[PDB]
């Protein structure tokens, strides 16, 4: 119960910089049968008011595990419904709360004809934003905010340790195979249902998995890629199939 002592001693900027705090958090979050889930989630959300990155990055890496747990337990059972509050709040603060204005992600397209810095012989394109503020979760816009939050999580890949990558790969392996005989072949036990994923979510999933291929995790990433390509082939989704096919033929 080290988390209890941490909460007691908590209730200045050098609070963070514990060796085994992440292990304790994973131990207490790996199952839903806990009694302090609500206060600890309140503290999780409170870790986000401060503008320093050393706390946001310290608390961001736990999202995939709780996302999987909430999306699997509910789709079956008691549901807390307070994790959706944290998800909606972080979505709102990442979509509006920067200085009072929204986010419009855009960049330019370099042209070879115009002389460049490295070579001599551009219209703005928006891929994300603006997103209207969301305050309730339904069965139509959930995947949009999930994809946006995953894209936000896929912005600081260097900082998180290998445990987060392993957990992400483990979740990715069985998230898209839960309702087919292939998971019976792979000998997975749990909820025998299916989840109607979207194309953009799988594309961001491929983007996330491709980085971990050369960072120690090899077999797990390969199996996850096989699951992704099998699911896309069965569901007839063009873009993830194209990306996976491109990735497959680029391995030594």
């Amino acid at each position: 119960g080290v988390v209890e002592e941490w909460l007691s001693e908590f209730k200045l900027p050098n609070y963070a910089t514990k060796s085994s705090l992440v292990s304790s958090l994973y131990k207490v979050i790996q199952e839903p049968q806990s009694e302090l889930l609500e206060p600890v989630c309140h503290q999780l959300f409170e870790f986000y008011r401060s503008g320093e990155e050393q706390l946001l990055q310290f608390t961001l890496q736990f999202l995939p595990e709780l996302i999987w747990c909430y999306l699997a337990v509910s789709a079956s059972v008691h549901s807390s419904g307070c994790i959706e509050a944290l998800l909606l709040g972080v979505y709102n603060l990442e979509i509006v709360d920067k200085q009072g204005h929204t986010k419009v992600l855009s960049f330019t397209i370099p042209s070879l004809s115009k002389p460049s810095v490295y070579h001599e012989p551009l219209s703005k394109v928006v891929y994300s934003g603006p997103h209207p503020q969301r305050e309730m979760l339904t069965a139509q816009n959930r995947f949009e905010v999930l994809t946006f939050l995953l894209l936000c999580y896929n912005a600081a890949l260097t900082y998180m340790p290998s445990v987060s990558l392993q957990s992400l790969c483990q979740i990715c392996s069985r998230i898209c195979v839960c309702g087919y005989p292939r998971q019976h072949v792979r000998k997975y036990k749990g909820i025998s249902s299916r989840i109607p994923v979207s194309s953009g979510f799988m594309v961001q999933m491929l983007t996330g998995i491709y980085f971990a291929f050369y960072n120690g995790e090899w077999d797990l990433a390969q199996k996850a890629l096989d699951d992704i390509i099998y699911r896309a082939q069965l569901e007839l989704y063009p873009e993830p199939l194209l990306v996976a096919n491109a990735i497959k033929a680029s391995l030594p």
């Binding site: 370099p110 070579h119 069965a139 139509q140 912005a155």
Partner: protein, 435 residues
């Protein structure tokens, strides 16, 4: 400056001899690092002098002695030093004789700049984390994607002119090397560009690369998939047919061709041919082929003109649907489509049971709830259908067909005032959704 070339030759020989002697034996490490640094500096001076003299043939020691340096830097983990060295290498004046090596380093940068850092781990080269090109009209890199796309574009443009044109008189090795280089650079380009959801320029680039492919499945398949994802149909269908001709082994390609044929293009015979080809050849694929054949038969039956063939096609579609259901009992889509097809023949209890089973498999489908309400309407139970439509509207408060069904049911059951209110709410929703 003003140094005879033989002094450069003898000092290069001395550098090579020192490099050979250092490795052949089991602080001085800093001396070795400084020797490598001065070797790099004299290499820069040598390349500047040679480009000057040519501006007005065997590189054997400089290449290894300069590349293995940053190879060992990467082995130890001095990423910042290596990337800074690469940045200052790319700033040199281009040389026509070195273009090939340029390719390498450029591609190498494209390999590392996409998998080794994040946005907040980027810094301007002018601060810590002779003639040099400068000016104000130069394109200063802003993000990783920007400079990555720029490097890939220049590499592709410079590699197109160096193609061997598939000479193939008697030898094959050079063409194989060129094809491998083109394949890897185009794969890097498509993985870099496809992440942003920009497809048409990818189609254009694959069209440009189409010159090399003569009997290669990979390039044809990538081009077909990119074209189909872009939005074009006829070209996608033609390339799908060509890919089918090339290798008749898989079933995904004919299934995609049938899906495109059955789509907005509104063709039926080609979908039938593709479905028959699929069913001619595990167990899931043949079930999907049967489902596609049944859907095609139903669509053909809808647009008939006389009596008998309508019943014939309805019976054929029902047989195909029941065969598909028998081959695989763990898919809700097949059961839902079977119930929908059966409801046409007015056989109410059986369709109700089948749609109940489909709801049992999965009950979050909007189409399933809509079909359930529509079927309950035929049994003269208006309040139950009204509640079902209300719950469906609660789950999907921005649909259109469910709103029309609700308006019709309210007009038939409650009164005109509720229909007027629903219509004005629908007008308000439409006004809000558009401009």
């Amino acid at each position: 400056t003003a140094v005879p070339p033989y002094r450069l030759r003898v000092i290069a020989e001395a550098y090579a001899t020192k490099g050979l002697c250092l490795e052949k034996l089991p602080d001085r490490e800093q001396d070795v690092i400084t020797c490598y640094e001065k070797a790099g500096d004299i290499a820069l001076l040598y390349l500047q002098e040679i480009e000057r003299v040519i501006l007005s043939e065997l590189g054997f020691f400089l290449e290894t002695g300069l590349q293995r340096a940053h190879v060992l830097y990467f082995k130890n983990g001095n990423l910042t030093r290596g990337v800074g060295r690469f940045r200052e290498l790319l700033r040199a004046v281009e040389t026509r004789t070195t273009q090939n090596l340029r390719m390498t380093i450029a591609r190498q940068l494209a390999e590392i700049l996409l998998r080794g850092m994040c946005e907040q781990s980027y810094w301007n080269p002018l601060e810590d984390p002779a003639r040099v090109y400068s000016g104000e009209n130069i394109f200063c890199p802003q993000e990783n994607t920007e400079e990555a796309l720029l490097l890939l574009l220049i590499s592709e443009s410079m590699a197109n002119r160096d193609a061997v044109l598939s000479r193939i008189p008697e030898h094959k090795s050079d063409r194989l090397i060129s094809l491998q280089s083109a394949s890897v650079v185009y794969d890097l380009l498509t993985i870099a560009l496809g992440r942003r959801g920009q497809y048409e320029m990818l189609s254009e680039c694959l069209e440009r690369a189409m010159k090399f492919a003569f009997e290669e499945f990979h390039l044809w398949y990538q081009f077909a998939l990119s074209l189909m994802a872009a939005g074009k149909s006829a070209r996608a269908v033609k390339v799908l047919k060509e890919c089918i001709r090339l290798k008749p082994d898989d079933a995904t390609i004919p299934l995609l061709a049938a899906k495109l044929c059955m789509g907005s293009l509104h063709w039926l015979e080609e979908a039938e041919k593709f479905a028959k080809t699929v069913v001619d050849v595990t167990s899931e694929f043949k079930a999907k082929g049967y489902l596609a054949l049944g859907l095609t038969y139903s669509l053909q039956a809808t647009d008939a003109s006389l009596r008998g063939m309508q019943e014939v096609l309805q019976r054929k579609a029902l047989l195909a649907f029941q065969r598909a259901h028998s081959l695989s009992p763990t898919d809700h889509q097949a059961a839902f489509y079977l119930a929908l097809q059966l409801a046409i023949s007015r056989q109410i209890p059986e369709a109700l049971g089948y749609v109940r089973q489909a709801l049992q498999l999965q009950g979050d489908d909007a189409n399933s709830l809509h079909l359930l309400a529509l079927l309950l309407s035929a049994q003269k139970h208006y309040h139950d259908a009204l509640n079902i439509i209300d719950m469906a509207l609660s789950e999907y408060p921005e649909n259109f067909i469910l709103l029309f069904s609700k308006v019709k049911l309210q007009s038939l059951c409650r009164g005109p005032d509720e229909a007027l209110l629903t219509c004005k709410h629908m007008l308000q929703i439409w006004k809000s959704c558009y401009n």
